[PDB]
Symmetry: D7
Subunit: 122 residues, 14 copies
């Protein structure tokens, strides 16, 4: 039932990214966040320092989160797997859609949920 708890937090995180609000992002991510993602060229990154770059140095877009499946593991742990559709407008003016498969693992540290691990493909 409180699977919807996770989905909301995931949605809030993606919202922060799309806004370039790094302070908002950091709040929701654990400081020791590990990340597999295309931009890391097949490396695992201690992904708080690595992600700053994309905020500090950066159009209309709409993110959609399909078939979010949440595994719950006792009081303080859960993981979410979901397809992220991103509608945007290419420089050449045309509208385009792009798909990513995303896995976010969540730990509740004192009341709030934290994202500790992130795996993105696409």
């Amino acid at each position: 039932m409180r699977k919807q708890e996770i989905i909301k937090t995931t949605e809030q995180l993606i919202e922060a990214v799309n806004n370039g609000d790094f302070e908002a992002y950091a709040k929701i991510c654990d400081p020791g966040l590990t990340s597999f993602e295309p931009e890391a060229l097949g490396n695992l990154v201690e992904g708080m320092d690595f992600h700053r770059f994309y905020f500090e140095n950066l159009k209309p877009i709409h993110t959609t989160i399909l078939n979010p499946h949440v595994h719950v593991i006792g009081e303080d742990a859960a993981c979410i797997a979901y397809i992220r559709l991103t509608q945007y407008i290419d420089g050449q003016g045309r509208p385009r859609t792009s798909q990513s498969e995303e896995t976010r693992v969540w730990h509740r540290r004192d009341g709030k949920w934290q994202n500790v691990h992130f795996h993105c493909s696409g």
Copy 2:
């Protein structure tokens, strides 16, 4: 308890490389979800989906290598592992090749033994 996970992950990969489906099923939760290249960007209820790859054939020589395994522990019963899998093998044309995958496995302890509940693989299968 981190070394506990790595061992189980290693045991799972061993089962896959052997085609021992019974061994695989033991270590995977029955409701295992999976993102992987062979699923064309879909999430699969990955016990039924994986059978096919076992039923239809270490025969060839291969060496799996697991680099920089990082394990997050979350209370008594939960942990997730992220690691690069290098796979040395021999192509049909006879040459030796290496392929890299980035893998994320999320683990739940159900009564003593660890179960794999979610799997995310990107790169080469």
Copy 3:
């Protein structure tokens, strides 16, 4: 007689899309509309939220609807299958035509017809 009813509604829906009238679109679509379409990269979308983007953020064209075949199923259900030819003018100035195969499933909710499912293949 009631087959021509569907075709008209389908035509009205396409008209709303070509006009960018989202209010008009929403009226004719069920709020729980599911959609398979090229712009969704082979995924099923809960297609009211997904479609807003194309209205809110967006030339001479003529839509043509060939060989509309309608299956009727009791008082309150019908589905339509039709080829959509779209004549338009490319940026380079030339006139082009593009074909889509479209399936729309309709439910009558209280007097008016609602589009509950949409399947589009070929060109957007």
Copy 4:
């Protein structure tokens, strides 16, 4: 409860196709079945006559080893006698060159209950 009814029938239909059991297929399809599908080159076909060809001239798809998977089946129900299903079909198979491959189709099947049993009246396949 009646949504799971449709999924089962859809599954039974796909089973018939993979087996090359045309008699089984015909039972589940309405005789006036319309179809959009890749093999019809963007045309709507009165798809009972059109589909026979693939049964009569091709060894069962299950002759070769294959596993069909049906993801996120969403069913709209419309009163007693009408329903439509939309689903992604993953098909695991083995190419002639010996390698294993997976292929995706997006499928829409519209169903009418004629006297107890469900009938497939329309089919839309893309991929």
Copy 5:
């Protein structure tokens, strides 16, 4: 004698098209004109509505009609088959020629000849 009648009408129709005179075109075409043509992507079109677009949204050219063969069928029916060579000047300034094979089926409705079907390839 009545074969030359058709050729003239066909010539008049092509003249209307090359002029963008839609009123002139409609007069010569039956209102229920069916058409196979490249611009219809292998579909049959109820080709009065479909053709408007090319008039409403649109230089020196010379049409040539080779080996027109006309079949006559009683008082009120005939069909013509002919190669249409079109000499024109491309945007890049060069002169170009293009070939089409055309079939027009004619019905005499009330004095005048009407084009009821059109098949164009090239």
Copy 6:
């Protein structure tokens, strides 16, 4: 009522072609049949002589299994003795390499009634050539 008459004759003609029955074909075609078709490279042919070749050189070497389908046949009638049909021909067949393929042609056939039976006087085909042997 008389439109279904044409469709049947068109169907019978295509049947003759798919069987390699040239006698059956000739019966249904006027002897002065003109034809535009892909195999004629954009030329009009006095298409009784030109068509023989595709019959005479379809042997048992080249008897693949095939199924023709005729979509949205639209028939224009013109007085007692004249009519024209326009239709899409889908042809399901099996390539030499063993795979099944489908090909589309757009076809226009103009018909003259000579004494009871219908005759094909003109033929226009665009897209894929779909004679057994092609």
Copy 7:
């Protein structure tokens, strides 16, 4: 009346070529035959010696001669222009068609017609 004379001779010449009957060919060609043709790489050839090669070193085919136009010039001279469609069967087993545009100039030497010049494109 004398136009049909030429067409027949042209047909007889093409027949000789399709049969590989060089003796039959030579009879109908003037011994000083000039030829433009694809196989001559844009050169004019004294085309009796040049043509032998194709006979001495060489299945079902049907030649068709479209819209033969014949110019007659007094008792002893005429030229024919015609499209040659050739239906044949490629080595890979498929049936193919090929088009050539042909011009043959004829001189009546002593009863029989002789081909003095030949121009082939395609």
Copy 8:
């Protein structure tokens, strides 16, 4: 002696074309001139109407400098009033981009003497089209 007569007339015809003098061209061509040529896409044209287009649409916008050369003209004579010429036409010109280019055509012209002057009744061109404007 009478062979050089033809070559001169052929040269005069090509001169008329390169000048865009259609009146001069028509004088030298029979009014029933037939033509095979690249610009006709493998069709025979009643080539007086078809050729006008290339004259009428060659303006001062399109007066490049060009030099025609006629190689190995071979002339067959056939009684008093008939002859045919076969020759390679090299055309030196200057492309729009400013560079100089050369193009080759193989040409066959059949001639009829009508009362003193020679008339061109048939024309066969293969290779590059070399009218000023192409």
Copy 9:
């Protein structure tokens, strides 16, 4: 404890390069530095003279140093191997990441550490 010493010096060297501070670079490099690197077309260069050019004739970037492994060899010698991820912004405006595998061999000459040899493979950064 003395491994973290090397990582810091390596980090300081990369910092100098990204700043175009050649004086700072020279301080940390031995004057007889040898170098294998993409820009040298498979040659070993006496890499103090060769490197000047890139400073004298030269946007936002972030270097990341993954899994630095340090071998120590007695008091005065150590070598470091590490993956260098470089986030930058191409001229066309897009953000790009590029990977290099780097080996730096260090000699302690009187208190301070000196870089005597450098091996770079992948993308020049």
Copy 10:
């Protein structure tokens, strides 16, 4: 004088590889050898386990070692950088040459020299 010591050991190591003598290789390599190399897809490998595969599963060839430059660092440490030309004969029968740039770092453990780190760029040999 002690530079020629290293070159000889490097030569002996390459000899062992070209012979498929894994025992001979292991003797000369430290058991904790780290390696950057083409076959490792830009990863650092704990390169004793990773290298076995190429021995266990494996024509005329001639290795040539150009401009070996050796840095010495006190009693027990040294590094060598050199270009390796490898003349061989492809399966298609033709003779081919391939170039690698190689860096080997050496530690003297009790009398004998050990290879502790290896960096190879260009062609795998």
Copy 11:
């Protein structure tokens, strides 16, 4: 009259080449023959030694010599320029034609004509 003399000798030389008769070739070529030709990669060769290779280490063909133009220069000198069409049969079985432009310069040494220089461009 003496132009036809050259053409015959040129024809005899080409005949010798097509037969692989090197003795016959050498007789007609000056011993100091220079040659530009495709097989020499844009170099001038002292072309008696260079040509041996093609005889010693080597199908139906017909050579044709178009529009041979001969310049005569006093008693003992002449040059010939001609297009050589070569009809042959490719390995794949099809018949092919290839064109070369050829220049041969001739010196009469004591009664017989000798080829002293050869320039070939296009296809070998």
Copy 12:
């Protein structure tokens, strides 16, 4: 001694071409000059009329900066009045895009002495 005579005349001819001096060219060429060259598309041309075009319509090749080089000129002499020269012509120039380029031609020129001065009667250029 008389071989160096030819090379000089050949050099003078090339000089005339690079300058666009047609009068100078005509003096050195026989009026019946035959020519094989790339610009003639594999045809032999009566190359006095054919060559005018390149002078009358093109700024001197020496308008742009170029250096011609003549490698390994080999001359066959044949009695008092006849000789032929074969040589590689390297041409250094500057492309429109600003870069410097070199291009190679293989050239054969046959010479006849008519009354004191040498005349070029035949020319073969490849490249």
Copy 13:
């Protein structure tokens, strides 16, 4: 006397990079032969041929580097040098590029000063 040659070779390359043709001519024998890419595989009497490259334009920034110069000496008056020339420069598009040439220069001492009599260059000009 080997270092004598290297200096003269360096002086010659300096003259070329400066466009000082007078300086070049002094150091080259007047009968200098040359194989080089710009000559399309021909040997050139390379004093006249080279003028063109001087007359028609260090303006742009470049750094030449001369690796592993090997000098053969042959009695009092003869020597030949073989060396790799790395040239760092900046392409028109603004990027920095490096190009390699292999160069052979043969030297004759004519009365006190050294003269370059033959030059062979392969790779990039």
Copy 14:
């Protein structure tokens, strides 16, 4: 005049290579021969050890040596520059020609000439 001395030795060296006679090759080459050549990938090689491979592990061919230019430098030194044309027969059966530009520097060590340096491009 004794330029021909060098050319002969160069010819003898190439002969040894084409025969695979390594003993004959070694005699004519100085033991410290340096070499730039395509097979060395832009490196200078101490080219006695490097060259063995091509002898120990290896059709009709004819080498031609064009415009050999020899610089002489006192009693004991000379260098030769020459184009080497190689006529051979490819595996596919066709005859091919290939060009190399070669520079060989020669030192007379006690009576016989030795090749001390070699530069090959092509």
